[PDB]
Amino acid sequence: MKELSTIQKREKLNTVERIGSEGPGGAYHEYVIKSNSMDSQGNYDVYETIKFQKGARKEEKSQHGVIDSDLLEIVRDRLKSFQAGPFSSRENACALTHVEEALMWMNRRVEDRIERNVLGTNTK
Amino acid sequence: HHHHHDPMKELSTIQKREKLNTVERIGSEGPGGAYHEYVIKSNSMDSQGNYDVYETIKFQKGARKEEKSQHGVIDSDLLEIVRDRLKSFQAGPFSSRENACALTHVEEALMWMNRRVEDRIERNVLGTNTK
Numbered sequence: 001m002k003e004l005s006t007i008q009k010r011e012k013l014n015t016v017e018r019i020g021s022e023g024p025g026g027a028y029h030e031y032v033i034k035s036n037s038m039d040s041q042g043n044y045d046v047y048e049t050i051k052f053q054k055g056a057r058k059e060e061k062s063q064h065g066v067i068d069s070d071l072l073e074i075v076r077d078r079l080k081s082f083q084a085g086p087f088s089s090r091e092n093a094c095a096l097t098h099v100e101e102a103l104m105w106m107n108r109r110v111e112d113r114i115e116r117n118v119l120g121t122n123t124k
Numbered sequence: 125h126h127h128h129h130d131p132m133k134e135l136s137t138i139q140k141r142e143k144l145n146t147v148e149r150i151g152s153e154g155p156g157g158a159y160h161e162y163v164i165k166s167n168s169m170d171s172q173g174n175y176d177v178y179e180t181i182k183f184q185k186g187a188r189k190e191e192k193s194q195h196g197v198i199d200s201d202l203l204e205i206v207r208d209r210l211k212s213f214q215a216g217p218f219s220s221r222e223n224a225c226a227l228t229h230v231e232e233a234l235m236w237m238n239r240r241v242e243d244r245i246e247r248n249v250l251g252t253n254t255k
C-alpha cells in the first residue's frame with residue numbers, strides 16, 4: 001500500500017503517502033503529507049503535495065521539481081534555529097549532525113557525478 | 125506564477141555547485157526561534173521570467189497542546205520522504221555508496237527525532253512550550 005512506514009510510531013502529527021508509480025531510478029516522485037486530524041466537517045487540517053524533479057535535468061521530457069537535498073536543507077535550518085533558541089536538546093544536536101552528514105554525502109554524490117561528467121543524465 | 129528574483133533570506137547550503145533550486149526562508153522567527161515557512165524555487169526560469177518551480181513548505185507553527193496553533197508539516201515528514209526516496213534509489217539500477225551513507229544518516233536523524241518525541245512524552249511535555 002501507499003502509506004509510508006515511519007520510524008516515529010506514537011503521537012504522529014501527519015501521515016505520509018507515496019503517490020503514483022515508480023519512475024526514473026526506481027523512485028516515486030510525488031508524496032502527500034496529510035494531517036491525522038480533521039476539521040469539524042471532515043477535511044484534513046493539512047494536505048500538502050511534494051513533487052520531485054522527475055527525470056534528470058539535462059534529458060528531454062524531464063519534469064521540474066524539488067530535490068531531496070532541498071528538504072534536508074530546510075530541516076537543517078530548522079534544527080539550527082531550534083538549537084539557538086530556548087528549547088534546545090541533545091536529541092536535536094544529534095539529529096542535526098546526522099542531517100548535515102547526509103547532506104554532505106548527497107553533495108559527495110553530486111561532486112562525483114560532476115567529475116564523471118554525468119550530472120543531470122541517467123547514467124551510473 | 126511568480127517572477128524571478130535579501131540573500132540573507134536564502135539558505136546557505138552544503139551543496140555549492142550546480143544547485144537545481146534555491147531555498148529561501150519566508151517571514152520572521154517564530155516559536156522556538158525557528159522559521160515556519162520556506163520556499164523552494166528553481167534556478168531556471170521560463171521564456172517569460174517565471175520560476176519553473178515555486179513550492180511553499182509550511183510547518184506546524186505552535187506546539188500541538190498550545191492555543192493559537194497552526195497545523196502544518198513537521199520535519200520528520202520531510203526526512204521520511206527523503207528516506208523513502210533513498211531506499212528506492214538503492215533498490216534500483218543507480219545505487220551508490222554515497223546514497224547508502226546518506227540513507228543511514230537520514231534514518232539515524234529520524235531515530236533521534238523520534239527519540240526526542242518519546243523523551244517529551246515521558247516527561248509529559250510533548251506539545252508544550254517546555255525544554
Ligand SMILES: Nc1ncnc2c1ncn2[C@@H]1O[C@@H]2COP(=O)(O)OP(=O)(O)OC[C@H]3O[C@@H](O[C@H]2[C@H]1O)[C@H](O)[C@@H]3O
Nearest residue numbers: 024025053054055056057058118119120121122213218
Ligand atoms: N540520491 C539520488 N538523488 C537523485 N537521483 C538519484 C539518486 N541516486 C540515484 N539517482 C538516479 O540517478 C539519476 C540521475 O540523477 P542526477 O544526475 O543526480 O540528477 P538531477 O539532474 O538533479 O535529476 C534528479 C532526477 O533525475 C532522475 O534520475 C536520477 C535517478 O534515476 C530522478 O528522477 C531524479 O529525481
Ligand SMILES: Nc1ncnc2c1ncn2[C@@H]1O[C@@H]2COP(=O)(O)OP(=O)(O)OC[C@H]3O[C@@H](O[C@H]2[C@H]1O)[C@H](O)[C@@H]3O
Nearest residue numbers: 082087155156183184185186187188189249250251252
Ligand atoms: N526538533 C524540534 N521539532 C519541533 N519543535 C522543536 C524542536 N526542537 C525544539 N522545538 C521547539 O519546542 C516546541 C515544542 O515542540 P514539541 O513538543 O515537539 O511540538 P509539537 O506538538 O510537535 O509541535 C511542533 C511545533 O511546536 C512549536 O514549538 C516547538 C519549538 O518551539 C514549533 O513551532 C514546532 O514547529
